[PDB]
Amino acid sequence: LYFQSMAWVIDKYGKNEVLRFTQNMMMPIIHYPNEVIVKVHAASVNPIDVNMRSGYGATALNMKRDPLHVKIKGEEFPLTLGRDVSGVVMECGLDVKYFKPGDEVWAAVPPWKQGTLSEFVVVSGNEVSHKPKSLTHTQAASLPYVALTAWSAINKVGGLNDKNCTGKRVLILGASGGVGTFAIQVMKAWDAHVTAVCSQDASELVRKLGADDVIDYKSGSVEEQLKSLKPFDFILDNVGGSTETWAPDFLKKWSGATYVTLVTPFLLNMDRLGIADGMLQTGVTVGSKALKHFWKGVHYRWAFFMASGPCLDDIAELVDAGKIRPVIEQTFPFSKVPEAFLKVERGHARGKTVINVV
Ligand SMILES: NC(=O)C1=CN([C@@H]2O[C@H](COP(=O)(O)OP(=O)(O)OC[C@H]3O[C@@H](n4cnc5c(N)ncnc54)[C@H](OP(=O)(O)O)[C@@H]3O)[C@@H](O)[C@H]2O)C=CC1
Ligand code: NA
């Protein structure tokens, strides 16, 4: 009689033990005419998933989940994590025009929506794209969240594109993870010269992906090494913290060189101080740092993941043209999501961890 479906959900924030498997998920529902229901075939685990499991961003994300303050506390639960999906379209609302049942699609889901570690996921038409024809679901599911994060930082915030990168020198701090391994490749597709900073053991990987130079950040003479290279037109910082104290100094000055960071206290400030005071603090940091770097002749920018079907269509074109490859470290069956989370939580990513749902 009833329709039941499967998911990994959490009922409270905490350590990995909060993960719970249920075969009693309700059927997915189209609430708005621009939504699409997708059968999840594969999903990837992202550090944002492990962090959100522990409560990270809860304050800000709850405001996003319920703008009106019309829901009660703990109303996000049960919460399905997972941001990436490769799969097949089951149903569309009446305003979706470019997708239909049976299409093979991928998407990155915003953090404030129910996630993809489930049999089905509801997404908005503007977040979804036809997946690369050349990739399996497993391969494709590794890409959307990291690719869109990289795209936001590089293209949208950085202003770099296929026409203006030729012979620009790019530094990627943290080149061996999900974002970095995508970033190396999109930058080489646009003919930039790429310097990758990563651990010694990742060096072969990042070179095969197209890194021109590699710096081992534990080599103990990173400064003399960077000092020995020409300056950079662009730095993508995926490490953060102390990197900001030395890395901007290696950009060309007074030439529109840009430092973009993906590691910010945006969500942490609101967790610690609340929405109003956290947002204030974030603004003070943003404003003082932008001006201070402007005075030293560089643009300093923050960048964030942003969901985009149209950007995914551009990415799928690069994949199918052979310019971007998926980099999958490991796959886990659906029954081993907790194990996949522990692996991610242990660190030292070399590309991506994918969950096979089908
Ligand atoms: N603002 C935003 O919207 C987003 C920000 N991000 C940021 O980027 C990271 C997540 O991205 P992702 O690419 O998926 O993460 P990963 O976990 O897949 O990759 C991070 C990589 O960084 C390496 N690393 C750690 N320390 C250093 C260092 N000091 N120098 C060079 N490499 C280092 C790790 O390897 P090893 O430790 O072995 O060197 C690992 O390969 C997080 O820090 C996250 O905040 C991610 C998504 C969205
Ligand atoms: Na598969």
From Swiss-Prot:
Alphabetized UniProt keyword annotations: Disease variant, Epilepsy, Intellectual disability, Membrane, Mitochondrion, Mitochondrion outer membrane, NADP, Neurogenesis, Nucleotide-binding, Oxidoreductase, Transit peptide, Ubiquinone biosynthesis
Enoyl reductase (ER) domain segment(s): 14-355
Listed EC numbers: 1.6.5.-
GO biological process, one term: regulation of dendrite development
Pathway note: Cofactor biosynthesis; ubiquinone biosynthesis
Reactions listed under catalytic activity: a 3-demethylubiquinone + NADH + 2 H(+) = a 3-demethylubiquinol + NAD(+); a 3-demethylubiquinone + NADPH + 2 H(+) = a 3-demethylubiquinol + NADP(+); 3-demethylubiquinone-10 + NADH + 2 H(+) = 3-demethylubiquinol-10 + NAD(+); 3-demethylubiquinone-10 + NADPH + 2 H(+) = 3-demethylubiquinol-10 + NADP(+)
Effect of residue 50 to G: In OPA10; uncertain significance
Record carries keyword Oxidoreductase: yes
Record's subcellular location: Mitochondrion matrix; Mitochondrion outer membrane
Tissue: Widely expressed in mitochondria-enriched tissues. Found in heart, muscle, kidney, liver, brain and placenta.
MF (Gene Ontology): NADPH dehydrogenase (quinone) activity; zinc ion binding
Annotated binding of NADPH, by residue: 176, 178-179, 199, 217, 238, 262, 303, 305, 348-350
Gene Ontology CC terms, in alphabetical order: mitochondrial matrix; mitochondrial outer membrane; mitochondrion
Main subcellular localisation: mitochondrion
Impact upon substituting residue 65 to H: In OPA10; strongly reduced NAD(P)H oxidoreductase activity
Database matches in InterPro entries: ADH-like_N (IPR013154), GroES-like_sf (IPR011032), NAD(P)-bd_dom_sf (IPR036291), PKS_ER (IPR020843), Quin_OxRdtase/zeta-crystal_CS (IPR002364), RTN4I1 (IPR037397), YIM1/Zinc_Alcohol_DH_Fams (IPR050700)
Enzyme class: oxidoreductase
Connected disease: Optic atrophy 10 with or without ataxia, impaired intellectual development, and seizures: An autosomal recessive disease characterized by progressive visual loss in association with optic atrophy. Atrophy of the optic disk indicates a deficiency in the number of nerve fibers which arise in the retina and converge to form the optic disk, optic nerve, optic chiasm and optic tracts. OPA10 patients may also manifest mild ataxia, mild intellectual disability and, rarely, generalized seizures.
Protein function: NAD(P)H oxidoreductase involved in the ubiquinone biosynthetic pathway. Required for the O-methyltransferase activity of COQ3. Able to catalyze the oxidoreduction of 3-demethylubiquinone into 3-demethylubiquinol in vitro. However, it is unclear if 3-demethylubiquinone constitutes a substrate in vivo. May also play a role in the regulation of retinal ganglion cell (RGC) neurite outgrowth, and hence in the development of the inner retina and optic nerve. Appears to be a potent inhibitor of regeneration following spinal cord injury.
Family to which the UniProt record says this protein belongs: Belongs to the zinc-containing alcohol dehydrogenase family. Quinone oxidoreductase subfamily.
Subunit structure: Interacts with RTN4, UQCRC1 and UQCRC2.
Protein name: NAD(P)H oxidoreductase RTN4IP1, mitochondrial
Protein's gene: RTN4IP1
